[PDB]
Amino acid sequence: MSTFIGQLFGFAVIVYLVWRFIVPLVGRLMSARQDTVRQQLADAAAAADR
């Protein structure tokens, strides 16, 4: 039952690598898209009341 521990260390380093490199950029991307559509709805309401 020692391959379990080795694979678990492998899984730990791979999840550390993803949480370090990948999740920041994808978070930034989805946040940029979120704020873009937010601004779109906001100026839609603005043009309506205008």
Partner 1 sequence: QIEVGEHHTATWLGMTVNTDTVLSTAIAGLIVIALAFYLRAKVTSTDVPGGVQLFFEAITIQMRNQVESAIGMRIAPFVLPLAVTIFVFILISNWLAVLPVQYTDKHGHTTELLKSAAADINYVLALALFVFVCYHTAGIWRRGIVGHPIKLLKGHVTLLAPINLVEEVAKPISLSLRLFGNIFAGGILVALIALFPPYIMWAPNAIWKAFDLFVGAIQAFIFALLTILYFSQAMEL
Q: Which residues bind partner 1 (CB under 8 A)?
A: 1-11, 13-14, 17-18, 30, 33-35, 37-38, 41
Following DSSP, what letter does each residue of 16-49 receive, concatenated?
HHIIIIIHHHHHHHHHHHHHHHHHHHHHHHHHHH
Query: CB-wise, 8 or 24, nearer to partner 1?
Result: 8
Tokens of 3: 């391959």
- For the chain, how many residues are written? 50
Q: How far is the CB of 50 from partner 1 (least distance, A)?
A: 20
Query: CB-wise, 36 or 50, nearer to partner 1?
Result: 36
